[PDB]
Amino acid sequence: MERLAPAKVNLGLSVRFRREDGYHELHTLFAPFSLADRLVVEPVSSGLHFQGPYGRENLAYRAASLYLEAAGQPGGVRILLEKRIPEGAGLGGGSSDAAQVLLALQALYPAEVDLFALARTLGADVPFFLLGRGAEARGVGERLKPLALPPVPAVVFFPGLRVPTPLVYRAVRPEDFGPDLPVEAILEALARGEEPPYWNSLEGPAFRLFPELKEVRGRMRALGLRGVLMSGSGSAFFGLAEGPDHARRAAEALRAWGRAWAGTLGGG
């Protein structure tokens, strides 16, 4: 079986306050983006044979192991993961990989396994990717409500500036806290091709600590992209294009400074 595991971007991210539990309450939109890892998943008589980054620590490996356990060890599987999405950049490739492995095994080895229970065990964004569409999220990003997003042309850019993800959160200050995102107005702005009334509260600390990031945004703005945001905790950025040729040409120009892809954001 072949599968495609699409990326996501956070189409706006607002840090609402610090919770009684010490994490930050978010309000954020998750939008699928068409850049996708390719997975080949095939049943075999025995064993779990996995090729991809991180070996046994890969979320998709853990997904397969959990599934086969839940299903009463119905047989083996061979999984090949070909990465197209950069890792640890706010794009959710690993979570998407794991979702597709769950869905593939569900088809290959039906056994009334509760995929969402497994996905919540795996955590991160696996429950989101199982939905196959956009979502509005609260809590720490895990409390989901489905959201229909208009499909629009977009560009994702990866500058190669990795820091541990807790850093950007530890750097957040009360002065960075925002209101809820105006969800309907953001959707309207996407469909109308306007500048969306969104923000990413994490850009507060991130641009203060890493001024290189403002240069990334400026470069994307100069190519005509609208609504340029760092995606979640970063460091990937996205921007909205006027049309598919514009997305392609802006992505091509950005390759001078890093990795870029033209695609579609939203769609379900």
User: Which is catalytic among the residues 8, 145, 180, 214?
Assistant: 8
Report which secondary-structure segment, H or E, holds 116. helix 115-122
Which CATH number fits the domain that encloses residue 56?
3.30.230.10
Among 12, 60, 59, 5, smallest CA distance to 35 is for 5
> Cis (ω within 30 of 0) for the bond into 34?
no
Q: Are residues 64 and 162 in the same domain?
A: no
Buried b (16+ CB within 10 A) or exposed e, 62-82: bbbebbbebbeeeebbebebe
Range of the domain at 193: 149-268
The whole-angstrom separation of Cα 149 and Cα 135 is 9
The whole-angstrom separation of Cα 107 and Cα 49 is 18
Q: According to the annotation, is 160 in a ligand binding site?
A: no
- DSSP of 30-62, one letter per residue? EEEEEEEEEEEEEEESS-EEEESTTGGGSHHHH
Report which secondary-structure segment, H or E, holds 138. strand 134-138
The whole-angstrom separation of Cα 236 and Cα 38 is 20
User: Which is catalytic among the residues 125, 145, 176, 245?
Assistant: 125
Q: Are residues 131 and 180 in the same domain?
A: no
**How many domains are contained in the chain?**
2
CA distances from 8 to 101, 115, 116, 171, 219 (A): 17, 20, 19, 24, 22
Is 8 among the catalytic positions?
yes
The whole-angstrom separation of Cα 88 and Cα 174 is 26
Cβ contacts of residue 130 below 8 Å, gap of 6+? 99, 102, 103, 115, 116, 119
Q: Are residues 160 and 126 in the same domain?
A: no
Helix spans in 123-222 (H)? 126-131, 165-170, 183-192, 203-209, 212-222
Q: Are residues 153 and 122 in the same domain?
A: no
Which DSSP category does 86 fall into? P
Which DSSP category does 258 fall into? S
Q: Are residues 91 and 23 in the same domain?
A: yes
Among 57, 54, 30, smallest CA distance to 129 is for 30
Q: Are residues 56 and 82 in the same domain?
A: yes
Buried b (16+ CB within 10 A) or exposed e, 201-228: bbbbbbeeebeebeebbebbeebebbbb
Structure tokens at 100: 């597709």
Q: According to the annotation, is 115 in a ligand binding site?
A: no
Q: Enumerate long-range contacts of 214-223, CB under 8 Å, 24 or more apart.
A: 216/157, 216/159, 216/257, 216/258, 219/254, 219/257, 220/155, 220/157, 220/250, 220/254, 223/249, 223/250, 223/253, 223/254
Q: Are residues 98 and 188 in the same domain?
A: no
Q: According to the annotation, is 46 in a ligand binding site?
A: no
Is 83 among the catalytic positions?
no
Structure tokens at 197: 């009334």
The whole-angstrom separation of Cα 153 and Cα 150 is 10
The whole-angstrom separation of Cα 261 and Cα 249 is 10
Q: According to the annotation, is 123 in a ligand binding site?
A: no
Give the resolution to one decimal, in Å. Answer: 1.7
Among 226, 228, 236, 217, smallest CA distance to 165 is for 236
Q: What angle do CA 253, 220, 147 make, to 5 degrees?
A: 115
Cβ contacts of residue 229 below 8 Å, gap of 6+? 9, 10, 11, 12, 13, 198, 199, 200, 203, 237, 238, 239
Q: According to the annotation, is 153 in a ligand binding site?
A: no
The whole-angstrom separation of Cα 150 and Cα 132 is 14
Method for this entry: X-ray
Contact call for residues 77 and 43 (beta carbons, < 8 A): yes
Could you give phi then psi for residue 229, rounded to 5 degrees? -140, 145
Which CATH number fits the domain that encloses residue 246?
3.30.70.890
Contact call for residues 75 and 109 (beta carbons, < 8 A): yes
Q: Are residues 80 and 212 in the same domain?
A: no
